[PDB]
Structures are given as C-alpha cells and as structure tokens.
Design a protein around this nucleic acid. Structure first.
Ligand SMILES: [Zn+2]
Ligand SMILES: [Zn+2]
Lengths: 550, 550
RNA sequence: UUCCGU
RNA sequence: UUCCGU
C-alpha cells in the first residue's frame, strides 16, 4: 500500500549533542526513543539543566504505546522526571523499557524528584532484547560500546522497512566490562536491507578510530603508579568504566579510593549496587581517607568541565573545610574540555598549578577517550548497514554534514541524506524519505525549583541588563510632581546625562497631569523619548524602568 | 658593589597572554618594554579592550628614560594611545624606539585616538639595532620570527649583568619575509654569560616544533587551489605573513583579493604602504569584486575568533547588504580558536555549514600555526642562553610552570626560576634574583568612549543583575504611604512572593514615618529584611532597589 | 558532551 | 592569543 508510512519526530538531539528524544509513529501507534536533558553554558545564568518540549506527547499521551531507553546517561534519561509527569501525570501503565542500569539510574532520579516506586511501568530488558511495541514495531536491541555500561542500539522493524538506530556508540575492541558491541544484529539488518540509518555523528569530523577505554586505563595506571604523593581524579559522573579503571589503578598501587561530589556519588552508588562497579575494598569518604599517607590515597571527584561549584573547583578556589590542595598532589583531569567550558577548565587547571599540584590532562597525557565513534568506525557501520536513507543524529550541523559527506564517499551511498532538525516531521515510506513539515518544539529551563521557574523572558531582559545595565526612574503624579533617576551598572557617559533625564521626565510628567492622562499611559510618554535620547547620546540600549505613582 | 641591582616590574603580560608591559630600572633611570592591550571574553559585557595600570609610571614619569617596542601587535602596542596620555600627557620628548611597522601601526593608532603627528618621540630603529638607553642600559635588539613582521628580542645589558628578553617568538626556518631569527646575538650573549632570561612561554606545554608559516602557505595554496567557487579567508588582522600567503595563493590561482573588516583593513593598509605586504594587482573592495565569477574571487575578512560583530559573523548570521553566504563558497578559517572563543567559533562554523558553505579549519586542515615557540625551540634557546635566573613570561601559570620544568630538565639548569606576576618587584643582582614585593597594579576597562567609562563596580552589580535579576521597590513617605514592587528578570518563585514584599516594606515605611527617620535611613530598614527574606525563601540574591520619596 | 558548600 | 553594520 502506497499510503503506509513511518513518521519520525525528534524533539531534541538533532543539530546538537544533548536532550536526545526521538518519536516514531505508524498509523495511530507512537513509541518514544529516550527522554534527554540538555545543559546551558552558552549565556543562561541560574539555569541548572534543560528539558525538550514534548507538546506533541501531551497531545498524543494515549497513542504512546511504549518508551524505549538506549542507556542511562543524563542526555538520554534526565528529562524523564520532568517529561513523564507533564505527559501522563503522576502514574502510567505505559511500558518504559531499559537495561538494569538504564532503569536503576532513572529509579533513583524518580526517588529524587518525589515519586512513588513503580508509579510508571519500568520494564527491564537486555541490551540485546527484542521488544514488540504495540502492533507495528518489533524492536531488536543490540549492545553498543560507549562511556556508560549496558548501552544499546536498536534495529527498529516497521510495516514498511528497517530503521537502524545505532544510538550513542564507539567500537571499543576491549571495553572495561568485556561486553563488546553486537554488530551481528546490525550486519544481519544490512543483508535484509536497511531503509533508514540513524547514526551517532559526534566525532564524524574526527579521522581514524576512537581509542579503547582499555588504553586509557593502561595510561591512567602509568600516571597513578608514577604519582609522588596524593592523586585526585575527575571525570563525567556517568562514566562507570572510567571510574572502574581509576579504582583498578588505585587498588594496583595500594591506594584507598575516596569519592566526593553528589553526581559521581549517585551514579557509582547505583553502579556498585547493580554489579557494574568493582571495588576490592570499600568506596571510602574524605573523613576516612584523611589520616592515610599521601602515596596511599586517591580522591575521585566531580569537576571534569571546571564546574563553578564542583569539588575540583573548590579544591582549586579554596575550598573545603575537610580538603585543600597540598603542593605535591597529582591532579588527573581524566576528561577533555567540552566547547564553551574550555575557559572554566583553564581557570581550574591554572589555579591548581598555582597551588603546587602537578596537573595531568589530555593531549599531554592520553587520559581520556571520546565515548563516540570516529571516522573508521562510522565507515564500518555505513558499510555494515548500506542504507537507502540516512539521518545523522547526536551531533551539531558540522558533524551531521561531515557524516553526510562520509556517507557520500561510500561505495553504495544512500539515495538521500537528510540533515536532522528538532521538531521536524520526517515521513518515511518503503520507497521515499522526506521532511513533511514541523511540530511545536523547543526547550524548557529547569532549576532547583523545577520547570516554569525560569521563562524565555526572564533571561531575555536579564541579558538586556547584563549587556547594557539598568536606569530606574521614579515618577510622581499629583500637584507636587517628583522625578528621581537612579542607575545601576550604567556607563559613566550616561551617569553624567542622568541629570538631563530627570528634567526630561519632569516635563513628560507635567504634560501627563495637564491632560489628566492615566499612570499606565504617562509611563510611555516617559519611556520612549528617554530611550531615543540614550541611543542617540550614549549609543547604549539600557534597561529603563519608569515607575508611575500618584 | 653589593648595593647595585636591577628592578624588573611587569605591569602586565605575566600569568596571562595579553597586555604585555615590562619595566626595567637601575638606580634612578627607568626604561619600559612594550605597552600592551588585553581582551575581555571571560564575563565582561560592553568592554571593547583592556589596558594595564601604569600607576608606577605616573609616579615616575621623569625617570622614564626611554620606551622600547618589540613588535606592532595590539598586545604590545595597543595600550599606548591610553597609557602615553596618562603618563606624560599630550606630548613627550622621551624616545619611543621601534621598527618601521612597529611605529607605523602606532602612528595610525595615534592618528585614530586624536593626536598631533610626532607629539611623542617615535625614534625608528632596526629589529637588530643597539640602543644606549640613558646611562645604564645598552639594548641589543635581535630579529625574531613571529606572526607579525619586524619582531625583535632584546639582549638587555645592565651594570650588573645580561638580561635576555626573547620577546614573542618562534624559530620559523622559512618565514614568509625570508627575514630569519638572529640567534647569533643570543648565542653570543650565552657565551658572555646570561644572568636572567625572559622567555615566551605561550606553547611551553606543546611538544616538538611550531610548523613554519611556509608550510601553512603551502597548505593554504592546496585548499584555495582546490576550491570550487568562492573562497573566504579569516585570520588575526595583525598576521601580515598569513595575509601575504593567502594573497600569494589567490594570485597563483587567478583570484582577485577583496578585503573587509576595519581591523584587517588597518594593518594591511600600513603594511602595504611600508613594503611589508605584496599584492601584484590592487587590494580590491567588495563593490569591485561583486560582478566577478565565483572561482576568480577571494574575500579576505575579520572574524577568526567568531567575533559577535565581525564580517564572517555577519556572513554566517545574515548579514551584509553587499554580501551573503552562497551554498557553494569555501570558507577558510586560517586560525585556531582562542580558549573562551571556542563556542563563538562553533556557532559561526555551524551557521556557515547550515548555509551551504564548505568550512575548512584546523585540525582537519593544517591552515594555522602558532606564532609562538614549542618545546624543541624553547629547549634550543634555553641551551643557547644557559641563564643563572629565569623568568617565564607571555603565558599563564600552566605555561610558566611547564617552562619552569622544561628549564629544569636542562643540562645546566638555572639557579632559580621565578613564576612571574603582574605588579611584582623583582630585584636582580650580579649574584641573586628574588621578588622583593609588589606595587599598585591591575587593569582598566576601555570602550568606544575610552578609559573611565566602565569601572570595576559597573560590571560588579551588572553581574549581580545577570546572575540573579532585579527587584525594584518604590517607597512613599507622607500621611498616605504607597509601596510598589516591580521585578525584571526575577524567578517565578519570587514573583509569587512579590505580594509579600509590598506588605513587608509597607510596615517598614510605617515605622519609618512614626519615628520621623530620614529617607536615607528608611531605605535600609526596607533593604535588609527583604534581602534576608529572599535568601531564606527563594535562595536567590537579586538586585534590590528601595527608592524612598516624600 | 558536564554539575548542584560543614 | 581576537574585534569595532549601508
Ligand atoms: Zn548521549
Ligand atoms: Zn604578543
């Protein structure tokens, strides 16, 4: 039938790295792939995290047959304690599939955001399971090597063809868990024929292969072993395999492992519980590790991206009542700086050097590997699948374009490659693939209070104040009119002209009472001429607040 | 005599990259080495540039025997149109030494900042000249290869020993000007014995050698030659050799060179005038180059660091009335992103890819080389000089420490290495080198209006507004007390509590008039309890403005 | 490809 | 190791 088609709507994850959320539909049965979280750092202060706009999912909260989860990373399972209550409400019998860790981390996230255990249907599946979603989707999951364990891809079987979603991946030949990528299901999918391939474009510009976690472990061992006195190690909290090799090194060289920072304390607790982490002794605290000699200590902490309030940031910018950087410690930044955090990292790195600690970080020391596949690995999957259509995902426009070209360079290139966009509707038939339009989409600013606390406008005029400053005018209606101009964060060129604005507003108030105009209309007779005067006089566009009282 | 000593005071350039300014003194004769400029990007909005605090130079404007300039880059000659008028005033007969370009660029900078030609004594010298400053300092200048031409180092001969200041450098074996580094004067200095070595620490962490500009030229030629249609090229305006090789490539492949952005338009004009740039034809404009076929055009522009208002930024974020990015153009970012501009660059890169232009940048394409020396070159100078004392400069704490270790790894390591700091006093004798204290130092925020327009406090409370938002309260004294609370950029948790603050201030005003307290004291009886309430209620510290009128 | 002070 | 719209 030429009427049959699959609608693919990503509400996040395209033309970007974070907030991964993919929606798949056939006729009237919907299935969602992941519920991601995004981070600010661009120019959004106060905001802790970000969540995608599921306006499509509120509208279709019934057609949602199941929610499938690839892995337990925040950019895949962080949005859910905010997305789930918005869609279904406090409870839902809709199955939410995932691996032990993928769900265990989510469980804890719900235990954090005030939730009854099992309010939502969290159905545990193997990273290699086959799940029949509704009556149109047969989901063949397959293990994929990445930063977080129990990560999977998905061979999405539809009544019109095969969608191969690689998910976040790398072809790590020697992963820390020994649990290698199941390329068999993928090679099997290719033979049958692949209609669409959704592939991780993170390092599509990066040539060659991504170094194995085993090689990073080997290096970490070499440096931790080398260490004179103390050893500090930072990484992304989520990276259980890295945490593992850092532990494996400490244990090898007779060091007791301490752990600080709630994020790493969270992930590890769940991982050690579910048998993903392996400590021969106990994961000590700072209190316990305190008395021990320097060469017998390893303090694992949060602050890989030089986070303003993290443990490593406090260690650099004094600090803790319990811990301070001693001139002798070895600080191992087992991560590479994320773009836009490069300066935050530099300040931290510099600060630690200034304190007297030897700082070890990439590229000098090969102590970090990307969880995402480089060109050679993408080249392999592209040959393994040979799709008709291609949708590069989990990557910015640069990455998606470079992957488009990498796919183009192939022997049997795809018939059509589409650069993915958030909230766009992609119609896929057994013969065609095309964007058929758009749906309501965006992002929601979340903080300590939650969603709705910070709107688009709160930051908008906050930027207006940041970039330009504030000028506040107090206008008094009545027989005795008073005008007072005060300005915070305003240019000295304008502070001189503050005397002129008082008289500029006094005559504007004078005419206001003369015409017996309302206070809501007098403010505008004050606001606009001062605005036009300040732009023509100082060239600055500051925040102007004309307060009108009787 | 054990009383004889040289005081070395850097007012900028240490523990950082920009605003290079070094002060050298013996008895009562001072000489200044460079007058640098710094850039914001950390978290300072509106600010265009930054200048060092010459409070030492105001106090000693007479002992200043001469001002020596190493090269014409802004981080070496940018502060001067602000520093010179502060120190000596509108005119001075104090000699300001420099090479043709070094002074020509300064000339134009003075022609820009309202100055009579020759108000200051700009004495032209060769990058290899010997200048007798006052009666204690014999300055042996020596050519050094770097990004900007006519760059020099200085073998500072004092009545107590030899100071070798390498200045900004790299050992480019094949520079674009063919004018190689004069290591002879340096090797000669070493034989005699080097007391102190002031060396460029920019790439002290970087192993090996910095690639030659000739190799970058060769690559630029390969890519510009390869190009299908249009070619756009961005670099630091200052980089005349790069501009040269980009021209050399266009000319080779029959392309006409256009030039946009005032910064690159400035440097090139002065360079083409003084015989540093070489165009076989004329440096066309966008107007002239408009009609020409795509494969016969090269538009050189500003925006190497994805600058918010630059030509390349406008080309990406539409844009110009004259020029727009066509899906076919080749964009060559002939620069590497400076830390903290990495995101600005990414937005630009992404935007251009989105428009349909092939973007070529490092590391994929070897189109940029650091103007600063890597380990092998520093290793060579360290062996060439073999100093007693060492002061790593033109680099952050990471760089200075790594250079300290690179100096330590040597055969004949220095007796003492000191990590440089701004406004610190370094006393050097024929036998010792030590920090003997500090002097008033810092930085001055400059913009379109100049110095004094933006203070430390303007940005301080501007940050308070950015990070937290504003809450403005209007208080009215008199028989009828009125309280009105308005808040811009405030959290929805606090917007609900705005009703509570009205009543919180109304009772504070009530007691204020009851006690007949002054308006200046009533505001504080309003300010503090609301401050303590907001912190205990919303956990936020916003900008609070209690305006008190009668 | 991040964090969230006795 | 930066920029500053007909
Ligand atoms: Zn991910
Ligand atoms: Zn410089």
């Amino acid at each position: 039938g030429p009427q049959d088609h699959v609608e693919i709507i990503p509400l996040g994850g395209m033309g970007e790295i974070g907030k991964n959320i993919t929606v798949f539909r056939f006729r009237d049965e919907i299935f969602v792939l992941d519920g991601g979280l995004a981070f600010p750092e661009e120019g959004m202060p106060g905001v802790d995290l970000l969540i995608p706009r599921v306006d499509y999912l509120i509208e279709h909260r019934h057609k949602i047959k199941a929610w499938v989860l690839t892995h337990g990373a925040e950019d895949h399972i962080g949005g859910l304690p905010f997305l789930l209550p918005m869609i279904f409400g406090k409870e839902s019998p809709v199955p939410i599939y995932g691996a032990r860790l993928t769900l265990g981390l989510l469980r804890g996230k719900l235990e954090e955001f005030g939730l009854r255990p099992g309010a939502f249907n969290l159905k545990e599946i193997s990273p290699d399971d086959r799940i029949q979603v509704g009556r149109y989707f047969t989901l063949d999951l397959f293990r994929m090597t990445h930063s977080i364990p129990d990560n999977s891809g998905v061979v999405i079987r539809t009544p019109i063809g095969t969608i191969v979603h690689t998910g976040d991946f790398k072809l790590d030949p020697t992963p820390i868990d020994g649990k290698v990528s199941h390329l068999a299901k993928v090679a099997q999918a290719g033979a049958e024929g692949v209609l669409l391939l959704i592939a991780d474009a993170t390092n599509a510009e990066r040539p060659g292969y991504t170094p194995s976690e085993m090689e990073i472990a080997k290096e970490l061992d070499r440096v931790i072993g080398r260490a004179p006195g103390r050893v500090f190690v930072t990484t992304f909290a989520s990276h259980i395999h890295r945490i593992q090799s850092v532990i494996w090194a400490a244990e090898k060289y007779g060091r007791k492992v301490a752990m600080e920072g709630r994020s790493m304390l969270k992930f590890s607790r769940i991982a050690l519980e579910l048998g993903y982490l392996k400590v021969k002794d106990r994961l000590y605290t700072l209190e316990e590790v305190k008395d021990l000699p320097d060469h017998q200590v390893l303090i694992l902490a949060t602050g890989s991206q030089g986070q303003p309030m993290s443990v490593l940031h406090r260690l650099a910018f004094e600090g803790h009542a319990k811990m301070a950087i001693k001139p002798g410690d070895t600080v191992i930044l087992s991560s590479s700086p994320i773009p836009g955090n490069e300066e935050a990292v530099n300040r931290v790195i510099n600060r630690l050097y200034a304190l007297g600690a030897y700082v070890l970080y990439p590229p000098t020391y090969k102590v970090h590997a990307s969880g995402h596949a480089s060109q050679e690995e993408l080249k392999l999957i592209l040959n393994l699948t040979t799709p008709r259509f291609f949708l590069p995902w989990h990557g910015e426009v640069r990455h998606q374009m470079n992957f488009k070209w990498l796919a183009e360079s192939m022997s049997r290139p795809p018939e059509k490659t589409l650069i993915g966009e958030n909230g766009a509707v992609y119609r896929l038939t057994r013969e065609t693939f095309e964007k058929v339009g758009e749906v309501p989409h965006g992002v929601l600013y979340v903080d300590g209070l939650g969603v709705g606390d910070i709107t688009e406008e709160i930051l908008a005029d906050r930027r207006h104040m940041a970039e330009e400053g504030l000028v506040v005018i107090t206008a008094l209606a009545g027989e005795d009119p008073v005008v007072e101009v005060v300005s915070r964060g305003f240019v000295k060129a304008g502070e001189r002209l503050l005397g002129e604005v008082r008289r500029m507003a006094l005559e504007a108030l004078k005419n206001g009472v003369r015409e017996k105009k309302p206070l809501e209309r007098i403010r505008d007779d004050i606001y606009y001429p001062v605005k036009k005067f300040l732009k023509k006089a100082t060239g600055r566009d500051p925040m102007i607040l004309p307060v009108v009282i009787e």
